[PDB]
Paper text:
We introduce the spitrobot, a protein crystal plunger, enabling reaction quenching via cryo-trapping with a time-resolution in the millisecond range. Protein crystals are mounted on canonical micromeshes on an electropneumatic piston, where the crystals are kept in a humidity and temperature-controlled environment, then reactions are initiated via the liquid application method (LAMA) and plunging into liquid nitrogen is initiated after an electronically set delay time to cryo-trap intermediate states. Traditionally cryo-trapping has been exploited to quench enzymatic reactions within protein crystals and thereby obtain structural information about reaction intermediates.
Here we demonstrate binding of glucose and 2,3-butanediol in microcrystals of xylose isomerase, and of avibactam and ampicillin in microcrystals of the extended spectrum beta-lactamase CTX-M-14. A sequence of electronic signals initiates the in situ mixing reaction by shooting a burst of picoliter-sized droplets onto the mesh-mounted crystals using our established LAMA technology. After a defined delay time, the micromeshes are directly plunged into SPINE-standard pucks submerged in liquid nitrogen.
Author numbering: 28 to 287
């Protein structure tokens, strides 16, 4: 197509490896660029963890109100919210909000522990039909993003298909799906990524990701006004370990997609 040429041109101008997957839910067509290649998810895998706890809430009705201790030894590299409740407690609802809207790594590790380890997160992915998603490590070592390392990776095709079933499909209950949609719309970390390349009248819920080798990710569900919703995944990684983040590439990919 024409989007393929411009995405390939954007990737050439960036010096890195770009992966894009779009699903238009009006006709279920797919716009893929390197859609079957493996990319490090970094903190875009947090959506899987929050959705798995939400799935647990379908049986444990009062699970999200359960308090969880935040002790100093739980602190890691980036804890913007959990820093404020040390020697106190946060409920699983506020931990999911801290993980999704502020990318709190301590909040993520608390979701992983609630699920019985990273194997419990991958289990939820297989239970909803995702055979590519694999979580192998806790935060922050899941952000190492070594080239060729299969740990903590997924493909754009699989992540877009899964994100649709969670936010638009019916892998979750209504209260759970609406709670996940509300969380993603309140994200505070994606102003410079997918959101920066979309028409400002479009409402977006998204989750960003960052890691070593300049890894810059963003997955998003997009509601255009007067049009069926869309799902967009943008993965980007770079050859140099000390590479700087490239959120501008994610915006440019979204603009190329939105024009399509
Ligand atoms: C996952 O994406 C997380 N990233 C990390 O833990 C990295 N070790 C890191 C990268 C850059 C600065 C500090 C730590 C969290 N999610 C990122 C994001 O959404 O962009 C993050 C920078 C907020 S940290």
């Amino acid at each position: 197509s024409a989007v393929q040429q411009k995405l390939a041109a954007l990737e050439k101008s960036s010096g890195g490896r770009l992966g894009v997957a779009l699903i238009d839910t009006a006709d279920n067509t797919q716009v893929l660029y390197r859609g079957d290649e493996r990319f490090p998810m970094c903190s875009t895998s947090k959506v899987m963890a929050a959705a798995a706890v939400l799935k647990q809430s379908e049986t444990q009705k009062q699970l999200l109100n359960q308090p969880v201790e935040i002790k100093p030894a739980d602190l890691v590299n980036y804890n913007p919210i959990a820093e404020k409740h040390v020697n106190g407690t946060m409920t699983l609802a506020e931990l999911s909000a801290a993980a999704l809207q502020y990318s709190d790594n301590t909040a993520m590790n608390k979701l992983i522990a609630q699920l019985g380890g990273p194997g419990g997160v991958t289990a939820f992915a297989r239970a909803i039909g995702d055979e590519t998603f694999r979580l192998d490590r806790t935060a922050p070592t899941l952000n190492t993003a070594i080239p060729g390392d299969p740990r903590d990776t997924t493909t754009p095709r699989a992540m877009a298909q899964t994100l649709r079933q969670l936010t638009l499909g019916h892998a979750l209950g209504e209260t759970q799906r609406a709670q996940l949609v509300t969380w993603l719309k309140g994200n505070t970390t994606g102003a410079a990524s997918i959101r920066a390349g979309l028409p400002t009248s479009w409402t977006v819920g998204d989750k960003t990701g960052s890691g070593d080798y300049g890894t810059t990710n963003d997955i998003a569900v997009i509601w255009p006004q007067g049009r069926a919703p869309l799902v967009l995944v943008t993965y980007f990684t770079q050859p140099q370990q000390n590479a700087e983040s490239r959120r501008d590439v994610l915006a440019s990919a979204a603009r190329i997609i939105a024009e399509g």
